[PDB]
Amino acid sequence: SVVKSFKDLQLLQGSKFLQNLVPHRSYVSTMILEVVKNSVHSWDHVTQGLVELGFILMDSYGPKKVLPSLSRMPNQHACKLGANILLETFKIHEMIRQEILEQVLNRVVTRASSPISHFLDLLSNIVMYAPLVLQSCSSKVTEAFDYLSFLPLQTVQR
Amino acid sequence: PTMLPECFFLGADHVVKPLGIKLSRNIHLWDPENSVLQNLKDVLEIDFPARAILEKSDFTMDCGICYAYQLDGTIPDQVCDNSQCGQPFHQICLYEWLRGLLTSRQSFNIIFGECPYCSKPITLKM
Amino acid sequence: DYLLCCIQHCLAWYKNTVIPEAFYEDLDDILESITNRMIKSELEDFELDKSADFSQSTSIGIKNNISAFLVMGVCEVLIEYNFSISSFSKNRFEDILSLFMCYKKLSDILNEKAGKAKTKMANKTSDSLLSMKFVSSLLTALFRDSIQSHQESLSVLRSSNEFMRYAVNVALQKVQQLKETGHVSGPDGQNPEKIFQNLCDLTRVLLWRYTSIPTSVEESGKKEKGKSISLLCLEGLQKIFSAVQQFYQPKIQQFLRALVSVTQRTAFQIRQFQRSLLNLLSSQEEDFNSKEALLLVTVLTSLSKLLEPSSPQFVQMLSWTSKICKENSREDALFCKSLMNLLFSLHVSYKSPVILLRDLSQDIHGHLGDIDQDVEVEKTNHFAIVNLRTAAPTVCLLVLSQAEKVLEEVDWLITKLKGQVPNQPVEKAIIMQLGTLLTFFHELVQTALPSGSCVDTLLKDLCKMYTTLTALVRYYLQVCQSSGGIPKNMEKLVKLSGSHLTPLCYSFISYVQNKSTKPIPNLIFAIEQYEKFLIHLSKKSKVSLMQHMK
Amino acid sequence: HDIITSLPEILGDSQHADVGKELSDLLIENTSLTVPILDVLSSLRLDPNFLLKVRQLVMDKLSSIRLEDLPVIIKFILHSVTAMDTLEVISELREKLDLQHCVSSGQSCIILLFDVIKSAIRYEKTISEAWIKAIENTASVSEHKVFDLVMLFIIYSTNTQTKKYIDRVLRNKIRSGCIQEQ
Ligand SMILES: [Zn+2]
Ligand SMILES: [Zn+2]
């Protein structure tokens, strides 16, 4: 549905003929993000699905083609949807922290073969936003330091 | 000591949020040459009260269930997220209360329920 | 090389910052000795060009290549140092010129040595070590600065050719680096704001050099007409604007305040750029530097991304572009290709192009003629940029690809209307579009195309046309029980497709097959499916649509 | 303890092997100094062949290490896996460990242990698939120990590609009369 969303939106925006005819319907992206704002309060059962979802988005539509319209925009926006989600949640749902964090790191460390640019970008945003929330989840960092020896160079500095 | 201590905030979730946000965004401005207070003041960008009146300011500071202070070391700390109630409680009293009621549902370490006094959504994390 | 670069940056920082004692002078006098001796050094101190010919066979050739690049980098770093010492001493500029002459000699040696083998090594196009901070300074000093305390001494550097093309090459290497990575090489190529600042300043410099001094000032030589500095600065401009849209989209206003919303700024910039393109074209040059024209239309395409399709300046752009399409002949395929690309890109965000596609197809039909060699049609009045060598190989492909885009959009519409069952105006706009595409194909099928990509693409697009008609009549089979009857406009559409299109389709199949694998079977499959489903529709619609078919 | 850890800054790139040898000679001699030796030896420059010998040399003495250190040793063992040796070393480890002897004192160190494993298998996939085979393939002996359940649970808890595989294994185990109440 989310891919379809973005295909639709790309086709619309490139094209005024469709913009004249179709009334601007909200896109699924937007709906999900709005879910997340309403999510804030008391919605543990939705958020725990959210996280899984977003990581499915990232896993699936992280880049591969360097190791165009069609492969970039509804993939780039998929991945960065993932990211937007998980950041927005990480602002407000303070109990699914260390599981974003640990899942990020889980995709950081080992792969180094699939391009992983997006994950560190995510991680940067995550951390910058509140690092004080990682002195509550600190151990999860120090065990990736034990793998810092084994990592390609661009990965480590960044 | 001058280094940042582990710190966090009790009270109203709607009141606590701008403190955590402001801390998080400005925490890089923390500086370990000053004092803890002199750092905290420009980091959290607020002042403290110096003995407003610390024995009785103007609040029945008791639990409002057990109507005591000092139940077994514990302090009134868990409060309502409401301007009109703001009623403190104890962890123990409010836990036993919410665990009874039919409305309450338990996630992993959290229980959501209704404040005894005002019947507004109140959270307890064990 | 890199060591000295670091050193001199450190020492410049030490001067500027640390003092506001008896240590930095050591390094100063070391450098000054290196300067004075490297001046009167030449090439047999390092046994270069003469004793070892830098061969990529031997170890010693590798030694000489590595050494030469080290030297070149050293040369550059002392250029930076000698510049950084004083306020524009003549003697130090003579030293810099001498260093540059050494460097450029080495460059023309290495160019010969990459002329023996191929330019497969990216080692002479390896980075310079100059800071982008530096290069901004260098170009400001060369072009804009006219302070007499510096003028007498800089006028020797201004007097260069090779030096000036070197200077812009350096900036271009920084820009290419900034595009390909996130950032550029040298010092403070990792804080983005500093890189942005140097971007803006480079941009101002190259704009000034392009606009103030024109391109028609080439008094160097007829080899330098593809290598003019007035060309290189505009090339840089193009890469800068692309790079800054790509990386620094949320700062274009503060990017433009170097050069009020985006509309008026961009409009004023476009007017100057497009006047530049006009005077280049309106010069009516028979030699015709197509490189500069291609780059001018490229930059205009790049800039036109920040005009809103609702702005009057957007419409000014579109009218101007269509005017260029209506006037200037300019016999070079890539000019026409880039310009038509621009025209369509601007046009479609204003309205559907199927009229223009039809008119362009009319032009195509004019010049080539027909299959039967007995249709005299010429409609050159419509669009001047249509030639024997342009419109036949080239324009057909673009106009058909755009028509394919139109068919994809109307296909999406047809899909949404099938799934839906907001009703009437949707189908009305759809059938309007489809009628104009049908007249478009009426013009295209009549033409005689060359046997290259043109014929198979035309047949494939006509297969897409029949598929769209199939989806349409399928939707009518879907809908005709609920409403009951067919709208008159659909009857007109199917009449025009029966009468106009299909006979000439058959004639074109015969014409392509007579002249001597899958698309033509696919086409006859599509046409038979169309006829079958039209039989179904004409029975289940209570309207006789086979009297219009033959 | 101090001088040993300082060893690699001191020595040049030549006289390493004999030190490795001599240190391995100390390692069979004294168990107290497993950890720091292994630390040093991961840091010095050795032949791959010597490493493998030291791997087997530590693993026979795996019961003997006082509890505290046991974690860090396995860290070593499980960085020091190739794709191909996986199953022998894993099978040996799975055999040799106990969880029975060890037991705040016992439990904390065990918890750390399982962390180390958790880490290992999180951050390197092949350990997981091999490890389950080393329980599945040891269907024979009824005598299976506390460990094997705990580890199956853990791997179910982590990476989820394996869940179906674990499930099938656990069924085959139950019907077969291996896995039972006690
Ligand atoms: Zn109480
Ligand atoms: Zn309340």
Automatic annotation (TrEMBL), chain C:
Disulfide bonds join C75-C102. GO terms for biological process: DNA repair. Residues 129-343, 356-550 form the FANCI solenoid domain. This is Fanconi anemia, complementation group I. It comes from Homo sapiens. The gene is FANCI. The chain holds residues 665 to 1280 of 1328 of the full protein.
